[PDB]
Amino acid sequence: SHMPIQVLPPQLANQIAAGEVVERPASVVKELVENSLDAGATRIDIDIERGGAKLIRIRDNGCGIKKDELALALARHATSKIASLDDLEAIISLGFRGEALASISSVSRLTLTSRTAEQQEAWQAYAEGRDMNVTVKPAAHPVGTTLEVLDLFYNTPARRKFLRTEKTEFNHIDEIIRRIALARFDVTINLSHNGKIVRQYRAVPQKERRLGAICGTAFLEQALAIEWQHGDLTLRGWVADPNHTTPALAEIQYCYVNGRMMRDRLINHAIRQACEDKLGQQPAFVLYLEIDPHQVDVNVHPAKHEVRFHQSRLVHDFIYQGVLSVLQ
């Protein structure tokens, strides 16, 4: 009570938020690419420098942002994706908090360059200072958006110390893009590090090509396609033969909830109870769960790392049977 209850300064409040949603450079790449995805992009170019500690650039060929909404694109709690509780409990987009760009801007030097098909001119914008004041100025750019995040954590020096080696940090970025590339086979994604191209995923409107290109040939050889459907619950993807799964292959344990990369304990357990009951070790897989958004809650973690299902036992059993069925 010595200190008066007071509203935190805009930048500091955003930095507090940034600590919860932006752990490392990979986290920045994750949010910006998901933004690009929500914008209907079909091609995404990601340029990384020094593990992302120096620069993180993401360009997409999405619908872009309107000149008079760029500042809103950087303001707290501002979003174009949802506008009510009804929209929230029926999420149909990767973003919905309207916080990512604001959090990231407060902990780096972020620039937003964009143009819409209806605009003849392009514009760039950036927040700045204790009050996160926004500047919008002229620019040259194609229809679409380019995000530039430089000096990550430069104003929160203590967080930078948690940064691992550049190589390590890039590996986490590379892993994120992997997870995202598996989520959207229809999107072309190019990733470069230090001027050199590391990968270029080709869009698929046979996914076997990309699957192998992303997870390796080893997985593709052991991969068993899945097609499981009940009421409105659907399970797709691939599961490897437990008897022919190695520790290396076990590093591939990806699951998605309505196209959103998730890491659910309920899902993994269901999948294991199936490989255990059959084999009689750690399974390798790439599963996609499709469900009515009303039956799942994705507003549990600020980074969307978790989800909770309204009918927990029903969903678990659905995946169990689904996997178990394929193994036989």
Q: Decide if residue 98 touches ligand ANP (CB under 6 A).
A: yes
Query: What residue 36 binds from Rb ion, ligand ANP, a copy of itself, none (CB within 5 to 8 A, per partner kind)?
Result: ligand ANP
Residues 6+ away with beta carbon under 8 Å from 321: 228
Q: Are 137 and 123 in contact (CB under 8 A)?
A: yes
Closest CA to 291 of 312, 271, 315, 267: 315
**39 vs 145: CA distance, rounded Å:** 9
Shortest Cβ contact with ligand ANP: which residue? Answer: 95
Site for a copy of itself in 80-119 (CB under 8 A): 80-85, 88-89, 96-98, 116
Site for a copy of itself in 283-302 (CB under 8 A): 294, 297, 299-302
Query: What residue 196 binds from Rb ion, a copy of itself, ligand ANP, none (CB within 5 to 8 A, per partner kind)?
Result: none
Check the CA dihedral 75-77-80-81 and report its sign: positive
**210 vs 201: CA distance, rounded Å:** 7
C-alpha dist (Å) from residue 68 to 8, 65, 303, 323? 27, 8, 27, 49
| Binding-site member from 36, 61, 79, 108 for a copy of itself (CB under 8 A) | 79
- Which span (60-68, 92-100, 192-200, 228-236) binds Rb ion, by CB under 5 A? 92-100
**101 vs 147: CA distance, rounded Å:** 10
Site for Mg ion in 47-106 (CB under 5 A): 95, 100
Closest CA to 251 of 283, 220, 225: 283
Binding site for ligand ANP (CB under 6 A): 5, 31, 35-36, 39, 60, 62-65, 73, 79-81, 95-102, 145
Binding site for a copy of itself (CB under 8 A): 1, 3-8, 12-13, 15-16, 19-20, 23, 39, 63-66, 69, 72-73, 75-85, 88-89, 96-98, 116, 155-156, 158-159, 161-162, 294, 297, 299-302, 308, 310
